[PDB]
Design an enzyme around this catalytic site. Structure first.
Site, short mmCIF file in Angstrom:
data_model
loop_
_atom_site.label_atom_id
_atom_site.label_comp_id
_atom_site.label_asym_id
_atom_site.label_seq_id
_atom_site.Cartn_x
_atom_site.Cartn_y
_atom_site.Cartn_z
N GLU A 1 -5.95 2.14 6.34
CA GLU A 1 -5.16 0.92 6.25
C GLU A 1 -5.13 0.18 7.57
OE1 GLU A 1 -1.22 1.57 4.70
OE2 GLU A 1 -0.49 -0.40 5.34
N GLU B 1 2.25 -7.06 10.05
CA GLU B 1 3.58 -7.04 9.45
C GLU B 1 4.60 -7.80 10.27
OE1 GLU B 1 4.09 -2.76 7.26
OE2 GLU B 1 3.33 -2.72 9.29
#
Ligand SMILES: [Ca+2]
Ligand SMILES: [Ca+2]
Ligand SMILES: [Ca+2]
Length: 240
Positions: free
Chosen positions: A53, A57
Site C-alpha cells: 500500500e 492521507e
C-alpha cells in the site's frame, strides 16, 4: 454496525507500476481521514501474505498538511514510514493535483507537479504485485493521530474533479519520460465499468464505508462523511 457513514472509491482493476494523479479538494475536521492511496486488495487478510500500500492521507486536525506512507510487512506486523508535507492553500480550502508514482526503483509523491517525497530502498523492493487506486473518507478512533472527532463538523465532503492513470513505460513516455497516459476519468458520471464503491469497515475506523455516500454531481465525484442516517449531499460543488 457503526454510527457514521463514510465512503471508499476504488478502481476495479489493479496494475503493476504507474503514475496516478487526482485533482481534489479534501475533507477535514478533527478526527477525519481523507485520502488517495494505492492498495493491493486483500493486504488486510492475516494469512501471511504481504501488505502492499502507498498513501496520501489528510489527517483532519491538520488540514494544511498530508501524511505520506508506504505500508509493507504483513497484517499484524506492518512496516511503515510516515512523513508529513505542507500543502498551501490548505487541503480542504483549495483543489490540488495529488500525484503518486510507483516504479521498480522508487515511489514519489507530488503536489501540483512538485515533488514532496521520493523513497527508494527496502519498502520499495517489497511493493511487489499489483495495486488499485483508491480514495476514502472516514474517521479514525486514534485521537493522537487525527484529533478528537468533532461530530458537529459533519457532514464533510471530499471532491474529486478528475483522475489520470498512466502506464509505466520506461524510457517511452513523452520526451523520454517513464509514463504514458492510459486513461482519464473527468467524473461527468460514475463509471461502474471502471470503479467500485466500498461497503465495509475495519477496526479503528468509526464509520461504515458505504455506497450511499459516493455522489456524482456537476462534473465531480463526491465522497461524504455523515452521521448514520443523514447520508445526503445538498451543497454546491465548488468550482475548480
Ligand atoms: Ca466526539
Ligand atoms: Ca470533472
Ligand atoms: Ca459496493
Amino acid at each position: 454496525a457503526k454510527d457514521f457513514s463514510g465512503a471508499e472509491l476504488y478502481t476495479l482493476e489493479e496494475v503493476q507500476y504507474g503514475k496516478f494523479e487526482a485533482r481534489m479538494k479534501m475533507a477535514a475536521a478533527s478526527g477525519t481521514v481523507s485520502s488517495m492511496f494505492l492498495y493491493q486488495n486483500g493486504s488486510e487478510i492475516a494469512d501471511g501474505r504481504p501488505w502492499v500500500e502507498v498513501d496520501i492521507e489528510v489527517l483532519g486536525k491538520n488540514p494544511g498538511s498530508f501524511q505520506s506512507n508506504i505500508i509493507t510487512g504483513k497484517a499484524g506486523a506492518q512496516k511503515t514510514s510516515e512523513k508529513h508535507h505542507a500543502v498551501s492553500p490548505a487541503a480542504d480550502q483549495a483543489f490540488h493535483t495529488y500525484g503518486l508514482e510507483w516504479t521498480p526503483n522508487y515511489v514519489r509523491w507530488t503536489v501540483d507537479g512538485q515533488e514532496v517525497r521520493k523513497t527508494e530502498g527496502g519498502q520499495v523492493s517489497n511493493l511487489t504485485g499489483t495495486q488499485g487506486l483508491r480514495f476514502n473518507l472516514w474517521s479514525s478512533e486514534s485521537a493522537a493521530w487525527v484529533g478528537q472527532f468533532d461530530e458537529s463538523k459533519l457532514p464533510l465532503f471530499q471532491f474529486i474533479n478528475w483522475v489520470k492513470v498512466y502506464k509505466y513505460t520506461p524510457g517511452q513516455g513523452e520526451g523520454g519520460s517513464d509514463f504514458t497516459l492510459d486513461w482519464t476519468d473527468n467524473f461527468d458520471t460514475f463509471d461502474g465499468s471502471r470503479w467500485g464503491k466500498g461497503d465495509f469497515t475495519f477496526d479503528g475506523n468509526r464509520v461504515d464505508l458505504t455506497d450511499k455516500n459516493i455522489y456524482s454531481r456537476d462534473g465531480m465525484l463526491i465522497l461524504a462523511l455523515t452521521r448514520k442516517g443523514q447520508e445526503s449531499f445538498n451543497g454546491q460543488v465548488p468550482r475548480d
